[PDB]
Amino acid sequence: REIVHIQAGQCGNQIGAKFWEVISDEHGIDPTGSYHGDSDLQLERINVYYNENKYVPRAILVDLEPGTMDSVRSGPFGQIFRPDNFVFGQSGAGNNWAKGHYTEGAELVDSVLDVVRKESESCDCLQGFQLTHSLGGGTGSGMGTLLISKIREEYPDRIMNTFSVMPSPKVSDTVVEPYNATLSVHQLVENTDETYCIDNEALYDICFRTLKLTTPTYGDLNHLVSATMSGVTTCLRFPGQLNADLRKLAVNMVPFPRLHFFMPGFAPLTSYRALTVPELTQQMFDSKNMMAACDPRHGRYLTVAAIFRGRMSMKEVDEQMLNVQNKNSSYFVEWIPNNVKTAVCDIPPRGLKMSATFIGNSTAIQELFKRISEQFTAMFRRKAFLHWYTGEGMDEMEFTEAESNMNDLVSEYQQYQDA
């Protein structure tokens, strides 16, 4: 039944706030936590995300500085969160994974776990956790991965899911993002069950090229993200058969434990006109609607989950999903039979009669790790910017080890791509 949601750092709290605004709207929950919807489908699985005549997100808001969480509290749905679930320090993490993971984050993490435990303890049957964060900064990356490790120690038989924003030079705050992301990926490989890889470069290019936004803001990017998070959690939050819980999703999507990094996608993305099931299906599988900046035609799908939302012919959905597989059969590994599963939920996202969300486990995700790996090495060969990390107690050897582990992941994807 219950999922506990955690959002850490600037990026993590910004996208996490938007996620809660969007799903609260879908479930008919207003900013004061009152239900004012008109379909029983809205409430049937509400307790997955909301404690209970008011509904309060099962959500913990974490940061090492107060500013983003002050904006959250002032923002649209800011009063819906439980006030005790805001856990924050004052010193910040300076875009530094070591600060998040080892020094500043270490001072705050026990207070976060106290709140996690209080939420877990009033669950009838906790399924596990979802974390929103970036990998490029300090708090979401360093403190978020510290939290994941501590949660795993205290709840080792629960599922850990992340929405992880991956940095890009094209949409960048500091030069040390590749260091922070490489250190984080090493943690995610060992300690998550499912990670949605959301590439800031993909978000930007979707906004700029497809949506025709001349100058995208983080706000624009987060709109994309929150739409995708809504889509990918649909089957957790509404009645249905397929991928209806975190553990069932993992069993269907993860054939080898380390290869749990998914490329999500959304359709439609266009700059009133009716969308057809054919169009949704074709757009959902097109590289330009995917959020990891990897070309799926450069690899193979191990597994895919597709979710369609809205009133539409179930027959035509099954038909088009079979057309795509049968027509592009070479991009699907042949040694996992029937590796594409399709769900359908009657409730569309706000503003859309019909939508589809894609979750692919593709060997092409190797390209994202390789890019981060190349940007890490260009700096690490000259030990550039390392003093920020060594001043917090870290040694060079830990960087060598993270780099190796991420290169190992890349090789593992390549192996299955060739098999």
Partner 1 sequence: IQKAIEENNNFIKMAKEKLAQKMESNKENREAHLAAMLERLQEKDKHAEEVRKNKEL
Query: In this structure, are residues 24 and 54 in contact, taking their beta carbons and an 8 Å threshold?
Result: no
Q: Which does 391 bind (CB under 5 to 8 A by kind): ligand A1IM9, partner 1, Mg ion, none?
A: partner 1
Considering only residues 85, 127, 139, 226, which one is a binding residue for ligand GDP as defined by CB under 6 A? 139
> Which residue carries 């757009």 as its tokens?
283
- Residues annotated in the binding site for GTP, as ranges? 10, 65, 134, 138-140, 200, 222
Interacting positions 215-254 with ligand GDP (CB under 6 A)? 218, 221-222, 225
Structure-token pair, residue 159? 């599922």
Q: How far is CA 286 from CA 168, 289, 297, 298, 363, in A?
A: 21, 6, 9, 13, 16
DSSP 278-324: HHHHHHHTSGGGBSSS--GGGS-EEEEEEEEESS--HHHHHHHHHHH
Min separation Cβ 89 and Ca ion, Å: 8
Contact segment (CB under 6 A) with ligand GDP among 124-132, 166-174, 250-258, 352-360 equals: 166-174
Structure tokens at 385: 């910017």
Give residues 1-30 in contact with Mg ion (rule: CB under 5 A): 10
State the DSSP code for 43: T
Tell the smallest beta-carbon distance from residue 64 to partner 1 (Å).
15
Torsion, CA 220, CA 225, CA 227, CA 232, rounded to 10:
170
Cis peptide bond prior to 31, omega within 30° of 0: no
Region from 5-13, 42-50, 99-107, 116-124 binding partner 1, contact rule CB under 8 A: 99-107
The residue with tokens 């057309």 is: 323
Binding partner at 28 among ligand A1IM9, Mg ion, Ca ion, none, C-beta below 5 to 8 Å by kind: none
- Encoded amino acid at 299, one letter: G
Q: Least separation, in Å, of the C-beta of 141 and ligand A1IM9?
A: 26
Which residues are documented as binding site for Mg(2+)?
Answer: 65
Residue with token string 């597994």 = 303
Of the candidates 205, 227, 228, the one whose C-alpha atom is nearest the C-alpha of residue 216 is 205
Q: Does 227 bind ligand A1IM9 (CB under 6 A)?
A: yes
* Minimum distance of Mg ion from residue 373's CB (angstroms): 23
- Near ligand A1IM9 in 256-285, by CB under 6 A: 268-270, 273, 275
In terms of DSSP H, where are the helices of 27-103? 67-74, 97-101
Phi, psi of 92 (to 5 degrees): 80, 175
Closer to partner 1 by CB, 125 or 397: give it: 397
The interface partner of residue 102, options being Ca ion, ligand GDP, partner 1, none and the CB cut-off 5 to 8 Å by kind, is: partner 1
CB contact at 8 A, 171 and 200: yes
Q: Which contiguous run of DSSP H or E holds residue 198? A: strand 194-199
Considering CB distances under 5 to 8 angstroms, the limit depending on partner class, which of partner 1, Mg ion, ligand GDP, none binds residue 4? none
**Binding partner of 140, given Mg ion, Ca ion, ligand GDP, none, CB within 5-8 angstroms per partner class:** ligand GDP
Give the binding site for Ca ion (CB under 5 A): 107
Residue (of 302, 294, 304) closest to 369 by Cα position = 294
Of residues 382 through 401, those in contact with partner 1 by CB under 8 A are 391-393, 395
Which residues form the interface with Mg ion (CB under 5 A)? 10
Which residues contact ligand A1IM9 (rule: CB under 6 A)? 22, 211, 223-224, 227, 230, 268-270, 273, 275, 349-352
Report the interface residues with partner 1, using CB under 8 A: 102-103, 106, 391-393, 395
